[PDB]
Symmetry: C2
Subunit: 442 residues, 2 copies
Amino acid sequence: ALPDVRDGLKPVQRRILYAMYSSGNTHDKNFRKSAKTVGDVIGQYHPSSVYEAMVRLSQDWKLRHVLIEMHGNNGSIDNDPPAAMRYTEAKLSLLAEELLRDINKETVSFIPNYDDTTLEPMVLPSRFPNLLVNGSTGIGYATDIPPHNLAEVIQATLKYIDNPDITVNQLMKYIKGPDFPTGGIIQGIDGIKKAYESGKGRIIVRSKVEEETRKQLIITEIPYEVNKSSLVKRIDELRADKKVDEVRDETDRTGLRIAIELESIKNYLYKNSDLQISYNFNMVAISDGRPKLMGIRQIIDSYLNHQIEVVANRTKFELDNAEKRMHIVEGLIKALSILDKVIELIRSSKNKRDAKENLIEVYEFTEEQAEAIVMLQLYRLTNTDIVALEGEHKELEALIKQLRHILDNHDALLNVIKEELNEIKKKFKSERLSLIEAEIEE
Amino acid sequence: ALPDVRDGLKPVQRRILYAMYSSGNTHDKNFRKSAKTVGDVIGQYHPSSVYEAMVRLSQDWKLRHVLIEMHGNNGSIDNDPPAAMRYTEAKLSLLAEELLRDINKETVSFIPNYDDTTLEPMVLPSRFPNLLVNGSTGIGYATDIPPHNLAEVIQATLKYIDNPDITVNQLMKYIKGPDFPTGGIIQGIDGIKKAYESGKGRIIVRSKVEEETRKQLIITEIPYEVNKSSLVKRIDELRADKKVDEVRDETDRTGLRIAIELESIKNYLYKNSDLQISYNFNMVAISDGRPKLMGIRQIIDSYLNHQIEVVANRTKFELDNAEKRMHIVEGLIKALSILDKVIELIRSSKNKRDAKENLIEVYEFTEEQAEAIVMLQLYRLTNTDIVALEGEHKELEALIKQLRHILDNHDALLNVIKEELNEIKKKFKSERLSLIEAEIEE
C-alpha cells in the first residue's frame, strides 16, 4: 500500500474522495453521514479499514491540510477510537476539491472497478502537490514523507517551472523543510538537504517547551506521530522512579498543554523519551508503475509532468466541445435564415430520420447539425433565442483561438499551470508551524 | 423486530428488497455482488446483520419461496457460515418482484429515512400474501408463523373475497395447513384448526423415514428449522451409549439423505430427539400500528384491505395520468389545426413565458397545454407524429371509462384483485411438500 507520486494517494484514499465527489458530498453542501460514503466504497471500489482511512484523512494532527472535514468524535492525539459511522458526519475540504478539480473533463485515466460494472480513476488531477504537502507513511515497502507547507511547495514548484535545472539548495529558499501540523522545533538542515537529494535523511524533532511563573515547565507542542497520553505516561514513570529528581495533562479543547513541576532536566527528558524524537525521510512513491525512491526534484518533476498531462487533456477536452458546439451554431444561424423553408421541409418528410436526410441531402447540412435542428423546442424560435445563438459565435471564435494557442505553444500552457497554481497558493496560504534550526544538539 | 401483516416483512428485510429493486437488481438482469446491495442498506436505511438477513432470505430450507436468489456459499442446513459479500452474488426472485410490483405508482406510503435525505416505504404492495407463504420467526414479542403453499393461500384468499363470512373449516378446503420447505410429515389437524381460529395451536412435525434393502433406515426429509449436523450428532451418541441397541450423513448436493443401520426403533428415536419435533403457532404480526395475535381470517382480511388500498391507489394514479395526458392531446390536436398561426404567434412573442401567456390569453389554452406545445421538438411536426397524436385519443377515452369504472364500482375493483391474484397463482404454482395426517401418534 503506497501512494502515487502524482496525487499522493493510496487506492483506499483515492476511492473515498472520489465516492465523496460523485455523491456531491462537497464543502458548500451539508455534512453527510459517514456510513453513506463508507457504504459506497466497500460496495463499489474496495474489496472497517475504509472507515479507518476515511477517518485518518480527517485528522488535524496527522495531515497538514485535512482532505475530509469530519464532525463528531474523529479520534484524538491520544489514539482514541473514533465514533461509529452513524453519528459521525463528513464532507470534502475546499482543498480536497482541488485534487478532484477538472476530473469531469477527460483529464485522468478511468478504469473498470473490481466487479466491472462502473469506472474509477487511476489517479486524481491533484491540482496541488498533495504528496509533499500531506506526506505519507506505512507498509513490502515502507514510506516516510513528512508534511510540508502548502505555499512553500507551490512557490518551489513555480520556481522549478521557470528553471527545470534549479539545484536542491536553491529550492530550499522556497521549500525550507518539513512543516509538521503538530508544530514543534526541527533540527538538521543537512538532514533535509540529504533527504532532498537522495530521498533519505535524518532529522531531529523537538517539543515546544518553556518555563512558567516554585517553577513549572510546559509542553505546548509535541513531535509528529507521537502519542500524547503515551508520552504523559512515560514522563509519569521516571518521576516515580527517581531517574530524574507532578505530571499533569492540562490539555483541553483549546490547545495542547502538558504541565510539569518539581536546562539539565529539559536536556535529560529529551533523551530517555519521545519529548525529542528523530525522523528519517524515506521518500518512496509510485512512479511509472513501480516503487521509486526519489529526492525533491524528481517529485516536483513527476508532479509537473502530471500537471502538463492534465492541463493538456483538459484543454483538448474544452476545445473539442467548443469545436463541436460552434458547428451546431454555424448550422443554426444558417437554418434560422431559411427558417420558413425549413419548417415546410420538415412537414414534407414522413419520419424522423427522413427529416434528417431530407435536410442533409437538400441543403448543405451535416448529421450533427441536422440532429440539433430537428430537436429544437418550439420556444427556441423566439426573439431572445433567435439572437442569443448569433452572439455566442463571437465568444466561441474567441475561445478557439485562446485554447488552440494553449495547445500549439508549450510556454502558454505552462503559464496556465503557473496561474492556477498561484491562485491556489494565495487562496489557501497558511503560516509555518515548524521552526527550523540548522545544527542538531547533543 | 416483527413483520407487518400486509407484506410479511421486518424492516431489515423490506429495506433490502427495496434497495435491490431501485438498483435494478431484478431477476432478468445479471447477478450483482452482495456488498453492492449491502452497502446501500447500512448507508441509506438501516442504522453484518444486514448480510445475515439478506442471506436468510435466500435460503431454500427456511422460506417456502426465496425472495433473493443467491449464488455462492449461502450457508447450509447445518448452519454453516456463508461466504463474505465480495464473492457472493445475488438478485431478486420473480416472486419478490411481485411484492414490489406497482411500488412505482403511488400505492404505498413513503417516509423519510434515518437521516432525512431520501424516502423509503412503510410497507410493500405485496401483490401476493407473503406473510402466510414465507412465514416468520424471532423476537419483547415472539412470532411463529409457519410457511404455507402459495396456491393454497391464494385460492383461500380468492374464496374469502367471494364470501367474507367463510368459516375456518371452509378455508381449510383450500389452505390445508403449513407447507414446510423441508417437507416432512405433519400431524395435528385439530392443532391447525385451533391455530387458524385463535392464532395458537400445537402440531407435531415428522421426518420422512423409510426402510431399505441386514436392513437400513433412511431419513429423506427432516422437520422445519432443525439442524441436520446437529441431528446427526444426536443420533450418533445414543448409538454409542446403547440407549437403543452406524450413523452416516450420506447427504450430497442431490438431496438430503441420512443412513442408519444396525417400528419400535423408529418410534423410539422420534421421542428422545428432533427426528420428531413439535411446532406451536404463535401468529403475531403488526396490524394498525401494534402487535396483534390473529387467526387466519383476520390475516386474510388484513391482506385484502391492503390489496384494496393498493389497487385503488394504483387505479387513481393511472387515472390522474390518463386524465393529465388526454388534456395535452386535446391541446395538441387543437393546436395542430391552427399550426401556421401558432408558429407565427410564437415568433411574435419575445420570452418563453411570454409565448405561454400569448398562447393562453389569445387562444383557449391552459398552462399545462401551453407548456407542452412550446416544448415540442421540430420533428414532432412530421406526418407520423401529426397523426399518432390523433389516434391515442381513442385509446385514452377507452382507459378513462375503464379505470373510472374500477373506482366507481367496488365489485369491479375486487375482480381486478381476483384476476391478478389468480394469474400469479397459475404462473407460480408449486406442489405441496408436506403430508398432512389428522391424528397425532403417541
